[PDB]
Amino acid sequence: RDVFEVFSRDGTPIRGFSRPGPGETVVLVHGVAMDRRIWAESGFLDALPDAHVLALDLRGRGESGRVGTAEGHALRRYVEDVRAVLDRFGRARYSLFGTFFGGRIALQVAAVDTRVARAFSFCAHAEQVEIPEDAVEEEAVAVEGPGGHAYLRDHFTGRGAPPWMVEACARVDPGELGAATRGLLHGSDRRTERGHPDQELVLITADGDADLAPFHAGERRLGAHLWLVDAPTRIKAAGRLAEVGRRVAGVLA
Numbered sequence: 001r002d003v004f005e006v007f008s009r010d011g012t013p014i015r016g017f018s019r020p021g022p023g024e025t026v027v028l029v030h031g032v033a034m035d036r037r038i039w040a041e042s043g044f045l046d047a048l049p050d051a052h053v054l055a056l057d058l059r060g061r062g063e064s065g066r067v068g069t070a071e072g073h074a075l076r077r078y079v080e081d082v083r084a085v086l087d088r089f090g091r092a093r094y095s096l097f098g099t100f101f102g103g104r105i106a107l108q109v110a111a112v113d114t115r116v117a118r119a120f121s122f123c124a125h126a127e128q129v130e131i132p133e134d135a136v137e138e139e140a141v142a143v144e145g146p147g148g149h150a151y152l153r154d155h156f157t158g159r160g161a162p163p164w165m166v167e168a169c170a171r172v173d174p175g176e177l178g179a180a181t182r183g184l185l186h187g188s189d190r191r192t193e194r195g196h197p198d199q200e201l202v203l204i205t206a207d208g209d210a211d212l213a214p215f216h217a218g219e220r221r222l223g224a225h226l227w228l229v230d231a232p233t234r235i236k237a238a239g240r241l242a243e244v245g246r247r248v249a250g251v252l253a
């Protein structure tokens, strides 16, 4: 692997690694309480032996620049972070894969960037959502205080999340966990659109998902394909991420 640095529209440095390969160029986008290490720890990276893999730390996470404001964590800023990575490696065609809110980010990048030939959203759909202001603020307070890492650790452990997902929360600054949570009130509630007719859009979730409705809505509205994994919940579906990587490798082949 080589490391890289790019700059987002608002000047935030975005750091990541590039794993060279002769195949498709794949850009991986992690979730809120994660960083770029989850791709190797989940086994997703090893499931793609031929791809040229680009994995970034989103703003405020890992080795990327700190933010510390709610508006600095607006969805549009994450989109700009990812598009800056697409610029650095100069390809005309990219395949994006994102986990949880990283899936929402990947879908929105696909909507605005004609260089995205494929977008895969793992355990997130593309539809408009209602975000309760009070509950999200409550959650921001819980995750940003001294007990925030334990709060997330206990929540994810209790819901059967994989160990790498539990452990990743403690590597995110508490202040950025709070700011990213509040950032969801700045645009993340809108649906995503199809970027161009030839795009391959894929949604993935647990076959036991208690709310599959919006995933089917994405099939109808965007012409997206729906992949299911054997799990009772979205969090437990994260235990299937390496398996999903193998299926992604099949598409890329």
Ligand SMILES: COC(=O)C[C@@H](NC(=O)[C@@H](NC(=O)[C@@H](/N=C1/NCC(=O)N2CC[C@@H](C)[C@H]2C(=O)N[C@@H](CCSC)C(=O)N[C@H]1C(C)(C)C)C(C)(C)C)[C@@H](C)c1ccccc1)c1nccs1
Pocket (backbone or CB within 6 Å): 031, 032, 033, 100, 101, 104, 123, 124, 129, 130, 131, 132, 135, 136, 139, 143, 151, 152, 155, 181, 184, 188, 189, 233, 234, 235
């Ligand atoms: C069944 O599976 C789930 O619904 C859990 C799953 N979530 C999601 O898939 C999506 N979101 C949600 O459905 C809801 N959103 C919340 N809060 C905003 C939010 O998302 N977060 C804040 C902290 C950050 C870790 C992240 C999060 O995960 N929080 C958890 C609680 C974890 S600690 C007690 C959490 O869901 N809370 C809820 C409360 C309202 C209860 C506070 C609404 C309001 C959007 C419908 C998420 C991908 C998204 C999708 C589109 C736009 C924005 C965000 C995940 N669990 C861990 C990783 S992804």
